[PDB]
UniProtKB/Swiss-Prot annotation, chain B:
Region (Required for interaction with PIP5K1A): 32-38
Superkingdom per UniProt: Eukaryota
Protein name per its UniProtKB record: Phosphatidylinositol 5-phosphate 4-kinase type-2 beta
Positions annotated to bind GTP: N162, V163, K173, D285
Record text on subunit structure and interactions: Homodimer. Binds TNFRSF1A. Interacts with PIP4K2A; the interaction suppresses ubiquitination by the SPOP/CUL3 complex.
A Pfam family hit: PIP5K
GO biological process per UniProt: 1-phosphatidyl-1D-myo-inositol 4,5-bisphosphate biosynthetic process; autophagosome-lysosome fusion; cell surface receptor signaling pathway; negative regulation of insulin receptor signaling pathway; phosphatidylinositol phosphate biosynthetic process; positive regulation of autophagosome assembly; regulation of autophagy
Classification of source organism: Eukaryota, Metazoa, Chordata, Craniata, Vertebrata
Amino acid sequence: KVKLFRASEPILSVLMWGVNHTINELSNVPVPVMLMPDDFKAYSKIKVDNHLFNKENLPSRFKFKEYCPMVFRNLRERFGIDDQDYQNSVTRSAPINRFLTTYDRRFVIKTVSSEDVAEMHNILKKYHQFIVECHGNTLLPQFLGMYRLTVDGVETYMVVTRNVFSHRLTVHRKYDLKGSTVAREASDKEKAKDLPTFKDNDFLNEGQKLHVGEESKKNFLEKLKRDVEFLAQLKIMDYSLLVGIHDVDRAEQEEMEVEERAEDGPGEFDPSVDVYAMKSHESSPKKEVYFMAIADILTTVNPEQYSKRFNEFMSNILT
Amino acid sequence: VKLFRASEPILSVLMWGVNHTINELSNVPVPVMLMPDDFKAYSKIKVDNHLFNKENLPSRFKFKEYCPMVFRNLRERFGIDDQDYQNSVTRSAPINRFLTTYDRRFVIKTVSSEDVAEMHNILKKYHQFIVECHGNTLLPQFLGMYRLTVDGVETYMVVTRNVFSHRLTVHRKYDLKGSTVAREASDKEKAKDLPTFKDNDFLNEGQKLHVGEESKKNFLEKLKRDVEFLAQLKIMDYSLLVGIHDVDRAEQFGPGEFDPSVDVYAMKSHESSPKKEVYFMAIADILTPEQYSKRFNEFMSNILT
Ligand SMILES: Nc1nc2c(ncn2[C@@H]2O[C@H](COP(=O)(O)O)[C@@H](O)[C@H]2O)c(=O)[nH]1
Ligand SMILES: Nc1nc2c(ncn2[C@@H]2O[C@H](COP(=O)(O)O)[C@@H](O)[C@H]2O)c(=O)[nH]1
Ligand SMILES: Nc1nc2c(ncn2[C@@H]2O[C@H](COP(=O)(O)O)[C@@H](O)[C@H]2O)c(=O)[nH]1
Ligand SMILES: Nc1nc2c(ncn2[C@@H]2O[C@H](COP(=O)(O)O)[C@@H](O)[C@H]2O)c(=O)[nH]1
């Protein structure tokens, strides 16, 4: 039951230690009837200066700050994430590859700028209220924690989200879509990578389509509508639709080759866990799973119109 | 769900501190041996909580634990489980400086900076002696040592295993130095319910302690090595805290019943003893030579028949 907080970088150990630390302290804090306004300006801060002690994995000296912990605890709850699960995902083993995933691929940890952290505060009261009135049903990023780590006098800002992708199903192709009239494509650099991040004209040029079926398309499009309208209400623009594609047969084969090396359920998922996943329509050219979520809402044409434009595009991404 | 609700913020910080450090230690491997650095080591944490978790805790505070690996090892060598130690401190506010945990198992004494220095001074040798005697000793048993910073004020604390029983009411206590001077209770002191008597008011009482010549064997075999250890360390002016539980009295879950592994210092009255009693006996207040050692030793050998 010993947790060592062992990691490739001291930053990771401190991250593991702080999530572990704060989740445990929160376990000693009654769950409130409601969130008070201060909760939105609140934060916790701990500074550690150990001497000749417990220095194998943690640095002797570091700081950890959690923004607005009462609010994020509540967000986790409304997103149906149990605090102990969250803690275990982060601390049972070092997050792996600034962009990390928890070792079990449930949670994504992004290193952000100070400005990003500033925007979360700005948007936080309304985002919460919006998560309340849409019952956690949303294509928006789902925020679970915000933290500032300090190691060797250096401050690092981090935001934890639920993975847009499945924690279990492989992605075989992703796109970052915006719907911009501007040319959007992948550099020769990108296309050369393993899992390139294709863009608008790649999607349009490939003739790609996402066969989800009318009932999913409608539910999807109703989410997209209020999400982008909510974002337009704030001063927010230039976010993307992150699209991941999972080829069910290709995976079955990949798995089969995986076991072969040892010797020598099929494209389904828990919609409560892989929250952005959608099956293909029974009459799809091939058996697929899609993951679709709005990306990057923190960091001519104005907002209101973007939501209008962004919206028309994603409505045409599918059938 | 522990709130750390207490009469006083210092106590809340203490409860929070022991909780925090014991949890942290449960993530630290038990080593194959203590190292010299473990005797100069510490943990420090500073807390700054804006608009968060203020119901019982101050928003800002510090908690420092001295030599946490050595005290964790001492706990084990005394047969104390970390989880219990933690539970005794945090389950409920320690009560009435001189506190005990809510279950009276552990004593919490405010002490001075010089005290904390003195402890660092004797600690390696004290530990070594605890090892060599397999935890069996009338010396105080030190379970942890802490410094608290609250409202800008630093406070030092040492935790010991309670000398008296955690259940058995003590009816009379004597502080015994074996001195050749005038040590008696003061008129005002002689007033309150729990009078701290001394040598003279004891030797002039004809009071003996009946444990047998057998328990006197164990006890005196113990006391000698202890006062010896203190001498070699050139320490003195320490007392023998003695407690007396009158069975019949309390009677007016059984009378005189107790768990020897928890009430480590308690001794049953002998069979042939006049009244039915339980005695509690340990050395106290040694944070500070031969003559005192041998003088002390004899005045104590003269109360066990
Ligand atoms: N709106 C808002 N912004 C904050 C708050 N706390 C910190 N920030 C912003 O977050 C960034 C980093 O804050 P730090 O916690 O490093 O002081 C800064 O850009 C800071 O202005 C807050 O309570 N409200
Ligand atoms: N650190 C910190 N930064 C804040 C706080 N409240 C607001 N800010 C910062 O204040 C700025 C707002 O300033 P304005 O642009 O309205 O003059 C934001 O960029 C954000 O960085 C706070 O409580 N703490
Ligand atoms: N597994 C996973 N990858 C992501 C997620 N969000 C973005 N990525 C990927 O990470 C890369 C950079 O992230 P971004 O700049 O959007 O933060 C992109 O190639 C994108 O496909 C996510 O939620 N989960
Ligand atoms: N000998 C010794 N004394 C210490 C050590 N740590 C703290 N002390 C002493 O204990 C007292 C309290 O120290 P503070 O922890 O308040 O800085 C001071 O007299 C200090 O010098 C140590 O590692 N060794």
